[PDB]
């Protein structure tokens, strides 16, 4: 999914990257042990690939 500005003012955006404390959540909710997110812009961009950390 995506968005770009139409308002012509500047924008401030927030998001999160889930780290369960156990795997049974991870398989139950999302059904992949693989994590891969890619939050992308022109200037900034970054990916996220976590595991469970107790």
């Amino acid at each position, epitope marked *: 999914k995506s968005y770009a500005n139409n308002k012509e003012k500047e924008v401030l955006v927030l998001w999160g990257v889930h780290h369960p*404390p*156990n795997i*049974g*959540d991870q398989r*139950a909710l999302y059904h992949t042990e693989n994590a891969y997110v890619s939050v992308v812009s022109s200037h900034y961009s970054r990916k996220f690939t976590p595991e469970i950390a107790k």
Partner: single-chain antibody
Amino acid sequence: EIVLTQSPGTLSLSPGERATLSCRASQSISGYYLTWYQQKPGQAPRLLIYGASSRATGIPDRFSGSGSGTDFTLTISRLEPEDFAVYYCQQYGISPVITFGGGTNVEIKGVQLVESGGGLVQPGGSLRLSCAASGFTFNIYDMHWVRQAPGKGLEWVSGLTTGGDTSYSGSVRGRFSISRENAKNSLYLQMNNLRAGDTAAYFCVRGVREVGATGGDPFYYAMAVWGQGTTVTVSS
């Protein structure tokens, strides 16, 4: 949420036998969406199967199911006289409404909650029930109050998520009112305008781990655990 239909509401079969039971709905409804129970008359219900395949804790291997979409199914590998019981079919609506099959008797041929206040009122009257918790964190789980007439199909009276989204039936709503207390580890159900449709045995029920907490509890979209229930009646 959708009307279900079990298949059959009672059956009579011999030992050393399978038993196929089909709970199917109006619409096609996606499959990690149901769970499956038993109950002995006099005992509270017990949890067996969830999501049309997968199996609960403290178990043999014999009860096993299948099916998808509109037609969900639980089958049985072996029948035994210790299974002499009514089995149920309980589904979490996307409209957050549990819906119930009408119970299925197997006849074989030859931690806890605690309820509070069950009993009599006058019809058109007013009465409250409470429940209370023991040995867990009543914080987390989405709770449900449930009813049952004797040897009848269940009905789901009400339930509430821990962030306040209520769900009732359109008939029962307004006449009942709930309220929850996690610091108390207890629950309340104030009730008014009571007629013979309420003449039934009720149950308090702990359901669903909401998203997040420490624990060695996983979650399903099944119940967690029941209570022993209690009788409530109008009369004169």
